[PDB]
């Protein structure tokens, strides 16, 4: 997009998104997942994507 | 021989299943692998045919033809005429008395 001298041809394979990782036993897990999902649904993430 | 109907029996004489076994043994080393047989439609003939067939399976072979006639019949010409058009001259007729004579 920025230095449009190259191209992005071809299809896409092995579809798997990113994420936030942490140890198996951590007291932040469910809350972090809930906050990410809530932001994703109410649209705060789309603003960041546009920006 | 069936233990289901004669649960109280024993004897010191071979049955005719042993006769069929000896048929197989004597035919085995003679180069006569075109066995056909005549069986009377009763209990004895059925047992003899079953024994011969189950013994023949141990050689990966089969009988060329199998025929049956009514017990105590009088007109067997059709059955014999049905047994002529084949290439197995090893008849193993196993009738009983008067049927054998006819």
């Amino acid at each position: 997009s920025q230095k449009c001298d190259l191209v992005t041809t071809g299809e896409l394979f092995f579809r798997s998104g990113f994420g936030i990782g942490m140890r198996k036993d951590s007291p932040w897990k469910q809350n972090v997942s809930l906050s990410i999902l809530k932001s994703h649904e109410n649209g705060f993430m789309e603003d960041l994507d546009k920006t | 021989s069936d233990k289901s109907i004669h649960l109280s029996f024993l004897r010191t004489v071979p049955p005719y299943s042993h006769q069929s076994s000896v048929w197989f043994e004597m035919m085995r080393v003679y180069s006569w692998n075109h066995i056909i047989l005549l069986v009377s439609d009763d209990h004895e003939g059925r047992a003899a045919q079953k024994r011969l067939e189950t013994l023949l399976e141990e050689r990966e072979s089969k009988a060329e033809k199998v025929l049956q006639f009514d017990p105590g019949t009088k007109n067997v010409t059709a059955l014999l005429m049905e047994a002529k058009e084949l290439e197995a001259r090893v008849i193993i007729l196993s009738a009983s008395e008067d049927d054998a004579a006819t």
Partner: protein, 202 residues
């Protein structure tokens, strides 16, 4: 004079040996109290059982607890899980469809209907089969007729999720979508299909 004899409507006849042509066979099982029950009855030509699904009897007094058989809830929609009709001839479920059963309701006060067998196939069913092969667990798939995907109305979840809410179904495979309020009550798994909210105009 006994081969083709009938009397008093209940025709019964003999053939060849002493085999009555129409017997009165029944089926029995060993109840938990060590007595024979009376499930099924081979009346004329059909088994005509009385139990829709196997009641999962306990083997012994010292056997391992049952922790594999479980109930799974899904509904019909989309090219994900579609329910067809049972084949008239060869009364089994084709070759690849799993045997899901739905609660059938008639109409009016006679709407109380039996659990008819209407087995289904689709896309989610393939994933369910692969999961069953991998994790080695047997299921009791059954359709849901109580609502829809789920909406908190009158402070009670209704439809699919509500079942999983009230300890009536340990899994809810199908066409669910992750959410914020939904994920607060039940715990989801990693997504396997991307979705969203798109718009289509002819």
């Amino acid at each position: 004079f006994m081969v083709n004899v009938t009397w008093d409507g209940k025709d019964l006849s003999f053939t060849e040996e002493g085999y009555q042509v129409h017997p009165r066979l029944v089926v029995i099982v060993l109840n938990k109290d060590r007595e024979w029950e009376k499930v099924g009855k081979w009346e004329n030509h059909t088994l005509s059982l009385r139990h829709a699904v196997w009641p999962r009897y306990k083997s012994f007094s010292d056997c391992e607890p049952d922790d594999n058989h479980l109930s799974i809830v899904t509904l019909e929609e989309a090219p994900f899980v579609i329910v067809e009709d049972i084949d008239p001839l060869t009364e089994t479920c084709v070759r690849n469809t799993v045997p899901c059963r739905k609660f059938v309701k008639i109409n009016n006060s006679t709407n109380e209907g039996m659990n008819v067998k209407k087995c289904c196939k689709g896309f989610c069913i393939d994933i369910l089969k692969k999961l069953s092969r991998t994790v080695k667990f047997t299921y009791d798939l059954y359709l849901v007729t109580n609502g829809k995907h789920g909406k908190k109305v009158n402070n009670v979840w209704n439809g699919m999720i509500g079942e999983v809410v009230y300890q009536r179904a340990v899994m809810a495979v199908g066409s669910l979508t992750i959410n914020e309020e939904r994920s607060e009550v039940v715990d989801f798994s990693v997504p396997f299909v991307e979705t969203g909210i798109s718009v289509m105009v002819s």
